[PDB]
Amino acid sequence: DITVYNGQHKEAAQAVADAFTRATGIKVKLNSAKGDQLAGQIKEEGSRSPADVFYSEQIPALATLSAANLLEPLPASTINETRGKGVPVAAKKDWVALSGRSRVVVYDTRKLSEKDLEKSVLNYATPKWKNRIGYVPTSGAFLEQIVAIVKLKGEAAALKWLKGLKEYGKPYAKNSVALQAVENGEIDAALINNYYWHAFAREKGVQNVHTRLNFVRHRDPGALVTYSGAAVLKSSQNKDEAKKFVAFLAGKEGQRALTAVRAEYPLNPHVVSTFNLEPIAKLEAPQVSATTVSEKEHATRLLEQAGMK
Structure with missing residues (x-):
């Protein structure tokens, strides 16, 4: 099971979290607050952080943690799921863009x-x-x-x-x-x-x-x-399934869970929003x-x- 730090809308995060659990059977706890607090909260905890995944609504929050060497590198397959002209890319390939508003x-x-x-x-x-x-x-x-x-x-x-x-x-x-x-x-x-x-x-x-x-x-x-993304922390003890979570987030099914409740443009091109987007x-x-x-x-x-x- 994993603990997700969520700066995204509780409704949007809830959807992805539950769908994830049906698809795999992994429980995802949620710690919700603004994108900034969580990032700094993660800075204070450091190697002793409970956070397994960081689901931020803003990219800077991901950046400060990337610049602070705290994020784990994601497989190219994952970061590729949402690649496209204009989409934010992680210099260290340590976080990935997910949706846009x-x-x-x-x-x-x-x-x-x-x-x-x-x-x-x-x-x-x-x-x-x-x-x-x-x-x-x-x-x-x-x-x-x-x-x-x-x-x-x-x-x-x-x-x-x-x-x-x-x-x-x-x-x-x-x-x-x-x-x-x-x-x-x-x-x-x-x-x-x-x-x-x-x-x-x-x-x-x-x-x-x-x-x-x-x-x-x-x-x-x-x-x-404005883009949202997700990242895994180097302090994670469930890196195995933390990655799987971010991978779901970028994957078509994960994109479908979010867009079934949230009106944010899917970065994954194989997804059709339930909203007229x-x-x-x-x-x-x-x-x-x-x-x-x-x-x-x-x-x-x-x-x-x-x-x-």
């Missing part, structure tokens, strides 16, 4: 259609959308969006984007709050994560849902896709490196400068 723009189909949207998420910080576009300045995805713009266009365009949003758009406490707002007819559209919406339409019933998602594509900064490669997400401490530091300071925090 994208940035989107949900809008009110009662008022707007596609021809009514922008070709760049950047054009939303203009007078054309004064109080017509919403955002969540305190979201971790909103921070990633800053970090990505800076990396794709430069600091100048990032701060300009932020000041324009503050000047025109409208801030919402959480992502779901920005979606309900669009669904109520309080605001035309809003910048959110595709996952929060799929789960809303499935629960209600798409025919009772007025909101719709828009994807910018074109390697736009608005097409930013186009192949991940079709999103045309821009190429970007992992976010660093100083990078978040930088983006957070830009939020202060924009007057959002």
